[PDB]
Amino acid sequence: EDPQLLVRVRGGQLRGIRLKAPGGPVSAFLGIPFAEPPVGSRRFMPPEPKRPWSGVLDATTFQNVCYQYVDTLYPGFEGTEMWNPNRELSEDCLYLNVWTPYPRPASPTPVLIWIYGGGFYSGAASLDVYDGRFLAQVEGAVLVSMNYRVGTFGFLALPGSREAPGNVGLLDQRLALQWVQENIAAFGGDPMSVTLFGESAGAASVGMHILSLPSRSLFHRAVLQSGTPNGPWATVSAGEARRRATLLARLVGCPPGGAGGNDTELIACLRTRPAQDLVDHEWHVLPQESIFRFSFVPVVDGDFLSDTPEALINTGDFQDLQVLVGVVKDEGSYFLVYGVPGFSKDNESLISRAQFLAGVRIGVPQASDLAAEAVVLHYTDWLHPEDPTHLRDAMSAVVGDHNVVCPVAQLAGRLAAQGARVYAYIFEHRASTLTWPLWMGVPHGYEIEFIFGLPLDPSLNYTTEERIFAQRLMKYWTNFARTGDPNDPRDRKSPQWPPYTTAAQQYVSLNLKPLEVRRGLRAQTCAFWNRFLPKLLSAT
Amino acid sequence: REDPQLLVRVRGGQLRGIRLKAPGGPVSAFLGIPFAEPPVGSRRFMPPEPKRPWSGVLDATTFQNVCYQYVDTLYPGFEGTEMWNPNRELSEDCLYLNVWTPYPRPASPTPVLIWIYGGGFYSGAASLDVYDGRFLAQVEGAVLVSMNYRVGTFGFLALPGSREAPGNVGLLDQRLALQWVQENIAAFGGDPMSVTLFGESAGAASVGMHILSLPSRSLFHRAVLQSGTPNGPWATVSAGEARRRATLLARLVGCNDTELIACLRTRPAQDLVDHEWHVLPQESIFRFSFVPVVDGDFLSDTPEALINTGDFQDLQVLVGVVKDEGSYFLVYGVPGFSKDNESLISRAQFLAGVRIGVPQASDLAAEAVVLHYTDWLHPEDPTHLRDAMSAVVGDHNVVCPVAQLAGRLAAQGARVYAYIFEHRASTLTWPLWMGVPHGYEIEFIFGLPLDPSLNYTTEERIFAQRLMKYWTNFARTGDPNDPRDRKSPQWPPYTTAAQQYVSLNLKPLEVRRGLRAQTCAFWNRFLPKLLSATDT
Numbered sequence A: 001e002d003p004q005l006l007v008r009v010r011g012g013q014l015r016g017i018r019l020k021a022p023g024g025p026v027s028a029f030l031g032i033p034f035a036e037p038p039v040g041s042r043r044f045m046p047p048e049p050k051r052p053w054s055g056v057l058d059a060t061t062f063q064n065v066c067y068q069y070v071d072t073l074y075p076g077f078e079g080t081e082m083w084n085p086n087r088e089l090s091e092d093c094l095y096l097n098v099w100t101p102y103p104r105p106a107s108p109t110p111v112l113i114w115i116y117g118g119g120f121y122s123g124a125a126s127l128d129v130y131d132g133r134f135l136a137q138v139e140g141a142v143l144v145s146m147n148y149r150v151g152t153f154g155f156l157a158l159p160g161s162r163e164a165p166g167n168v169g170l171l172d173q174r175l176a177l178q179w180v181q182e183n184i185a186a187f188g189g190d191p192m193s194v195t196l197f198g199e200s201a202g203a204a205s206v207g208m209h210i211l212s213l214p215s216r217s218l219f220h221r222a223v224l225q226s227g228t229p230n231g232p233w234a235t236v237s238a239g240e241a242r243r244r245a246t247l248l249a250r251l252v253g254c255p256p257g258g259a260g261g262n263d264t265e266l267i268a269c270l271r272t273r274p275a276q277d278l279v280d281h282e283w284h285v286l287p288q289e290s291i292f293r294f295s296f297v298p299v300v301d302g303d304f305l306s307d308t309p310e311a312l313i314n315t316g317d318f319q320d321l322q323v324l325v326g327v328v329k330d331e332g333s334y335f336l337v338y339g340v341p342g343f344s345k346d347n348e349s350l351i352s353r354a355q356f357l358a359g360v361r362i363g364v365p366q367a368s369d370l371a372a373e374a375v376v377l378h379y380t381d382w383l384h385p386e387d388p389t390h391l392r393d394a395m396s397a398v399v400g401d402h403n404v405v406c407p408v409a410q411l412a413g414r415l416a417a418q419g420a421r422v423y424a425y426i427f428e429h430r431a432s433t434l435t436w437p438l439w440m441g442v443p444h445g446y447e448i449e450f451i452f453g454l455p456l457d458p459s460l461n462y463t464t465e466e467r468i469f470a471q472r473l474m475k476y477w478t479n480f481a482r483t484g485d486p487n488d489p490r491d492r493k494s495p496q497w498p499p500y501t502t503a504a505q506q507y508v509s510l511n512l513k514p515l516e517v518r519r520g521l522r523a524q525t526c527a528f529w530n531r532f533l534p535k536l537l538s539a540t
Numbered sequence B: 001r002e003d004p005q006l007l008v009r010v011r012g013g014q015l016r017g018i019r020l021k022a023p024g025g026p027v028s029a030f031l032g033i034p035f036a037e038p039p040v041g042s043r044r045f046m047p048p049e050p051k052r053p054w055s056g057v058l059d060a061t062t063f064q065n066v067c068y069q070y071v072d073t074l075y076p077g078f079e080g081t082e083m084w085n086p087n088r089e090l091s092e093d094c095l096y097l098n099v100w101t102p103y104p105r106p107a108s109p110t111p112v113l114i115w116i117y118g119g120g121f122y123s124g125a126a127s128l129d130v131y132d133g134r135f136l137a138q139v140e141g142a143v144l145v146s147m148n149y150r151v152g153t154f155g156f157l158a159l160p161g162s163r164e165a166p167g168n169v170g171l172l173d174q175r176l177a178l179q180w181v182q183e184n185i186a187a188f189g190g191d192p193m194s195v196t197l198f199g200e201s202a203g204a205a206s207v208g209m210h211i212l213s214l215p216s217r218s219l220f221h222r223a224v225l226q227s228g229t230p231n232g233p234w235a236t237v238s239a240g241e242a243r244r245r246a247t248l249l250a251r252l253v254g255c256n257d258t259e260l261i262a263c264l265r266t267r268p269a270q271d272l273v274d275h276e277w278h279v280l281p282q283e284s285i286f287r288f289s290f291v292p293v294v295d296g297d298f299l300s301d302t303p304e305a306l307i308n309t310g311d312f313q314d315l316q317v318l319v320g321v322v323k324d325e326g327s328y329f330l331v332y333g334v335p336g337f338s339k340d341n342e343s344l345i346s347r348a349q350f351l352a353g354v355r356i357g358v359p360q361a362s363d364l365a366a367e368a369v370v371l372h373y374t375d376w377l378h379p380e381d382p383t384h385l386r387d388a389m390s391a392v393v394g395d396h397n398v399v400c401p402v403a404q405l406a407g408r409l410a411a412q413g414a415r416v417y418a419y420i421f422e423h424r425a426s427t428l429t430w431p432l433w434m435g436v437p438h439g440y441e442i443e444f445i446f447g448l449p450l451d452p453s454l455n456y457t458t459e460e461r462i463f464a465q466r467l468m469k470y471w472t473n474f475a476r477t478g479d480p481n482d483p484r485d486r487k488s489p490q491w492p493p494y495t496t497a498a499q500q501y502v503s504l505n506l507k508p509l510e511v512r513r514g515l516r517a518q519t520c521a522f523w524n525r526f527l528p529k530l531l532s533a534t535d536t
């Protein structure tokens, strides 16, 4: 047929499809099974390498989304729907995608592996905003985006157990990585320049790979957008993981009656429950009412993660590492409508003070009273402690800083200090297209469109600057991808992006106006969160 | 034959004053008038008993003894330090007051201004050149009274509940002086119905105490608290602490409460002064040995309690603070600070100094403080660190307690006026790094720049006038604003809602909202909870 859309892989033949990007043709190999479907008695189990196949495996289309909760908060609303599954749900979802430029690159092009985010409970490479055709067509890079097990399926764990040891949604990603290694070669990809890049929980994931030895040998560069492995939401202890597994199990009738004491039977029992049964009780295992906290996520097992990601970034050796890190203007905005009284995407959410005080307890569930006070002290504007507008924006700040920004900063600094070559940024441009209210500004995850290059598509209603902007962004990423320096290669155009350093603390303003270097990532505020607050908590 | 204008008859007898010359004219001055029987011998530690009547004409032309106290020998010969030291023979017999009126004495009853001097309750005197009534008297026509009150062990050593050493006597001395004015001030042309109290540091604390003590409250109508409050970390002590110290000091000099006080009364006054500092419990600064005890008598409850639950509708108050309240004190106990160099310190000193400045803090409380006052972008910059250490001490001990008091008073009916003094005396002898320290506003209020003999500038003289106008207008009408003269900058009341105060500097008045708002919420609201959580 066409040697361009026909490829032999370590397991067998494949057939891609030829996509048409604004600037030209692209080869796309969608739905490549990287592992044997983790269904049946394989559920909660580490993934296994897909067995070799006979004939030509079709790969002209997107596979099934892993089993996960579907958002029903705002039915029909693009702002939420855009994140929901666009393919059928199934426990048989272990496939990855590959975009290569048409025709295949002359020599070993650098590879950009994307890891989607969604609180470790949702997400899919199948998504529109994760369309890696532009970054291949335009920047000529080999882009790979895989699907990994979310929710209970990916992270339910009974630490120490043989049949649900946890973190399998990560081993999924790791397995996709080992694949890209021994197989990307055939797509014109360089198995020597693997640059991982993900947002939210994907970012947190990327971090996990950096912190996990076995994952090291599978990548060389890393980008962590709006998320880290060290936060208050990305991991749970062994005890908590268990307490939530058993509880979820219990709710689903596992085991039935007053029988118990055997984890194997407990999992065996769980393995028989319809997928939707688990998803039904996913949210009932949280210990307190909250936001930006997820039920099933990576666990500190002492295997995939040898110790807390905190303890790891604190004492790891990141000398050789080259990382790109960042954040958006208002991380915490999106999460407010999902459980904080007074907040809706429909009104301006001009909240009362009491609403704000309550909100603080939700957004910071692990906080004792005194610690809550501290947070209130810090975020209240005492000249106007009643102004609804402040209270509103302050709530978004508490959430966004606590969960994303400060942890980012804590990582960046701890990384740089450890030997890493870190680069930081603050995405501040609010897409014109954006359907969420003005009050949320630049919400968690609204940088993707630009990094992926969606504004390049003419049909989509993006402004010309946004297009130029997107290209600029794609440039930084791909540049960081090949070189390990997001800067205009040789061609020293103009503004330079300096490495974030402990002493200097430099990050850049990623927006319409050319680069604009700044110092201190909420330095003051994050000193509160990263230095003080912790000891306030470990006292109370 | 006598000058009819300098001969005054007072309840205890007659007295002759002296005609003084102020820059713009003559002024009458009656100095060293006794208002109490000499608190000596067995009268030591005891409350003041009224001055017994005398015969003949008492000589009220010269200042009297300064109350027995400690003398500041830190920087021998240094004006900025000596300007506060005793300028008359020390003696226990020091209970006298001074009145300054225009010359000739005013025809119409004029508003009285009563000055209570600073000095951390361990020192001070009305004898001091900075507390000179002559300018206020001559330029504004005020009747200015100022008294001496016992300090240190003599005026504040307490064995709560005993008869022979009840404590707070120095505060009683001031009250007695306040009564004396009530009675006798009419004789000089003063109006007993328009008494306005004003003080600085411990002086302002004392003023606050009179506001919070019922008896004293019916002896004045308005008040001005300059860089000082009744509430706050240093102004008062528990009854148990007061006793811990008193008992300790007693033991330190070789001494049943009665039998103890008896022994302390045989000790030479200097023996006491020498040991008064040995009783402090911790390595600190801006923390004094013998201050007002909360006896449940003069002070029914704590000033904190009292300002939170009191009626203050019938009160007009002027409160303020100078731009660099902390500096002066760093020099006294925080390593790395000297008047001689620029005192740029290392983060290590800043850290060890916060424990000096907030001696009562727990490691966590301290760390909370450190976190607040650090510039995390340059946590090592000695300049910022130096400036910051000064703010910790100023905010903790003065600025915030003032903001607290302003809010509580305002909240509970009072009419409050607030300011921040920002001008640095051109003639200032303290290093430029100390900015406008604690006490360097006084000389302007009292009108010293009006004396051409002193080397102030023309602007400074004009400034002094403006301030004297502010104070007197307030002492006169409860409002510091120029009445008829709807001039230019109008000074609005501090309200809990708007939180406005003004800038007292060479430029015209400027209104500012929120007095160290965010920082004071840390000290006032949060720090205490954290403090109690981590307490002993």
Ligand SMILES: C[N+](C)(C)CCCCCCCCCC[N+](C)(C)C
Binding pocket: A071, A083, A117, A118, A119, A200, A201, A283, A292, A334, A335, A338, A444, A445
């Ligand atoms: C922004 N994306 C999507 C890319 C990543 C964010 C994932 C976190 C979603 C927060 C809302 C959780 C709501 C939980 N429920 C629906 C159960 C209330």
Ligand SMILES: C[N+](C)(C)CCCCCCCCCC[N+](C)(C)C
Binding pocket: B084, B118, B119, B120, B200, B201, B283, B284, B285, B286, B287, B329, B332, B333, B438, B439
């Ligand atoms: C300017 N006036 C006279 C109105 C106020 C003077 C206040 C004196 C400050 C002394 C601080 C001592 C601190 C404790 N140690 C002994 C450690 C220095």
Ligand SMILES: *[C@@H]1O[C@H](CO)[C@@H](O)[C@H](O)[C@H]1NC(C)=O
Binding pocket: A341, A342, A343, A344, A346, A347, A348, A349, A350, A351
């Ligand atoms: C916004 O709307 C939600 C639900 O419609 C409501 O709970 C909230 O009180 C509203 N807030 C304002 C400020 O209108």
